[model samples]
Target: MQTIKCVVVGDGAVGKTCLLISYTTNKFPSEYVPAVFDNYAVTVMIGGEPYTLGLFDTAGQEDYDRLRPLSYPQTDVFLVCFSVVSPSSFENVKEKWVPEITHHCPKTPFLLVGTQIDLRDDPSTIEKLAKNKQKPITPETAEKLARDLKAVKYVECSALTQKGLKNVFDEAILAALE
Candidate 1:
């Protein structure tokens, strides 16, 4: 059987671990577990072949930064993520996340995904950023970045509700096949 390694990356508290947990467990987590540990695997049937999807939990904190890239060797695809409410997380996509991955594994492909779309409709969510004079990161602009950054695609999803989560992994498998 073939296997694909998919690693998630983003700033701390941006739902790196949450996505995988919600995906595998099929429920929303009430609290975060701080940095990702352990791993999750899924068996999928594609056409007539079976593939193992390996999911890793990564720490986006600065202390874990140096230790993180070692996990990337032989990686098939990446889930580069950020939360729409966390604008700083969006800023680092190009400046740090994309640069690190592209420089280290230029041949591989990834999908830049934005999490927390469900938060976009909250009145307080807007007010929360209004204090900082900013708003949620727009999907249109993020989509443009996905195209410009040469990713497989840019996905918008909510791990809490999983409104559009499956596409990221499905797309990951397709990009890895190439």
Candidate 2:
């Protein structure tokens, strides 16, 4: 089968692994175990053609800074993700992740992803952000950033609720095909 390689990058603990695991298995992860490099594959039918979608998860910590790009060489598309509740993580989408990916895969397309949408309204989450004088990132804000950064699109999801999760890959497939 033909294949599309989609590598995910973002700050550590931003739900990158949870996003892939929840999508592939229909179950959410309960614990936090930092990933080095974990990969999953699923056969997707796009326009009646079977294609293997390779989802590569990378460590987001600074320790992996040098190692992460090793997975970027042949990436067809990238999921540049950040937690909606994390303003710093959102900032890194431009400050760090985008530059890193574009440097290695200059011509590759990527989708700006906001994860943990399920917590966007949770009281505790809101209170925590408010304590820092911050708030959950709105879709409008994310979409604008995507356009500014030349991302293929901006998509948000909750690995916990599985909301908007499938669409992320669907869009990734379309970007790769383009």
Candidate 3:
């Protein structure tokens, strides 16, 4: 069997661990501390062949001095998560995450995930709320970010409801191969 190394990263409390728990273990934690780093090794049958997937979920709030060297170069595919409710987190992906990842893993495939979509009543609700909250990243804005980052794909998911979770992983697996 072959293996692919993947990593998930984002700002603290952006639900990186929650997504991993749900996707890998089919369990969701009600509360999780912002872990500095967590690693998992799992197997997926891609193209009817078994392959190992080494996953790393890194801390969002860690100092770059410690995190950049550890995470940026090791990933084959990177999932950059941002909360739909927090525009600043989205901005941080733009200001920090994308550039750093590109510099370190220039050839690696990446994806953008806007999590916590279940919190909003509608797809547009987050944007409307952001307007009042002085946030800049909307669904549209996120799409642009994904494109600019040259991401393999983009998705919106709700870990609480499992909405769009399967598709996110399915697409990610496919994207990693491509």
Candidate 4:
């Protein structure tokens, strides 16, 4: 069986666990705590191809310092998620998370996900918008960031609605397999 290790790292309450639960189990928890660090192992087969994904959900809080080191080496793909409502978490991706990922696992492919689209009252008013809005940027910020990071892909999703969730994984799996 072919296996892939995808680590979801972001600040707490950014919906990492929710996304994983929705994707792997197709079940949503009514309530959840932005975990410090939680892991899930999923076995999936797409187009008759079998793949096992080990997901690591990390805490964005300062208290979970120990897990960061342990997380770096094993990651094959990373989903760096952040809330659109919290600008600080978005900033953290650029300032902190990306650097750590690059430093520890230079060869790993990563995707930046902006979560909580359900909270967006007006999508047009988003601060970062990408060209044609094809990519996941509020006002092109994600596109620019993806370019800067040389990331394989960028996507936005809402775990609550399952909107754009499959697209996110499709792009991710394509990137990982490519």
Candidate 5:
């Protein structure tokens, strides 16, 4: 079977890159920049049968807007990402990212992904600093977005600590397989 693309998309600097890089390599990518995210492959067993999971990532800059959908030709599922650290990105999950993916891959399934949980769940004054503007995403509220968008589901994880990371992909696998 041809491994269909499991694409991740979101606003620029939103860690779509880090999620894949971190999930595949366990090291977070910070400084390095790439024209496009790498297409990574990993094999897994489902019911004792090996399956190939093909991964993809997208560029979020406006310059790439016209170019982004060109890669939509082969997506089996989408992982639309936002940052709990970035409230604006969270809003875009409904206002932009999800809508954009639906326009192209209308029949394809997607998951609403919230990233950067490590920082949000950290015990610190950072939450207080951005209490009004920089507050992290509300957990149940994210589920509402998933419901609103009618996606497969809303899932969150931290690329840094890999918290809830495996589950995110596991859910994606089921969504795709379904």
Candidate 6:
């Protein structure tokens, strides 16, 4: 069976682990524990053929900066994630994650993924960001970044609600096949 390696990178606590866990298990993690390096494998059917989709999670802290790229060598595709409700995390997608991935795997394709969409419209979330003069990232903004970065596409999801969760991986599969 064909296997696709999808490596995920983003700011710490931006929901990368939650995204993978939710997608693979059909359940969201109840707590946030910073990921070190974890992986999940799922069998998916595409065009009547079964394939293994391997999801690799990497730590986003500066402490792991030297070790994170170790997982990039054979990556088929990358999911550079950022939380839609966190402006800082979104900024890092361009300022850090994308550049880091491209530097290590210049020819590999990647998708700009916006996670934590469930909080994008929450009143408390909005109020929190408002205090810092920030707001949730809109789809249009992320799409523009994806285009500017030459990413395969921009996809968003809510791990809590399972909204648009599957499409993220589906697009990743298509990108890998291409």
The residue-by-residue lDDT of candidate 5 on 82-134, one tens digit each, is 66765666677667765665558577665667677767746564566456556
User: Which model is ahead, 1 or 4, in terms of TM-score?
Assistant: 1
Between prediction 4 and prediction 6, the one with superior TM-score is 6
- Candidate 5: regions farther than 4 A off: 29-38, 59-72, 121-134
Give the CA lDDT, 0 to 100, for residue 134 in model 6: 83
Query: What is the lDDT, from 0 to 100, of the residue 175 in candidate 2?
Result: 62
Kindly give the stretch of ten consecutive residues in candidate 5 with the minimal lDDT sum.
Answer: 56-65
Clashing pairs in 2: none
Give the alpha carbon lDDT tens digit for every residue of 7-111 in model 4: 666666535566666776665663854435556576767888777767665444558566555654665565666776555556776687657665575675667
Question: What lDDT, from 0 to 1, does candidate 5 have?
Answer: 0.64
Per-residue lDDT of 31 in model 5: 74
lDDT of 1: 0.67
lDDT of 6 by residue, 66-90 (tens): 6656664776565666666777766
Model 3 per-residue lDDT tens digits across residues 54-83: 777554445556655554365556566677
Listed in order, each prediction's TM-score against the native is: 0.78, 0.77, 0.72, 0.69, 0.73, 0.77
Task: Output the lDDT of residue 56, model 2.
Answer: 67
Model 3 spans with C-alpha error above 4 angstroms: 32-38, 46-48, 59-74, 121-137, 176-178
Separately for all candidates shown, the number of backbone clashes (residues 3 or more apart, or on different chains) is: 0, 0, 0, 7, 0, 0
Q: Tell me, what's the RMSD of every candidate?
A: 3.3, 3.4, 4.3, 6.1, 3.6, 3.4
Per-residue lDDT, model 5, residue 141, is 74
Q: After superposition, how far is residue 134 of candidate 3 from its true place, in Å?
A: 3.0
For model 3 the TM-score comes to: 0.72
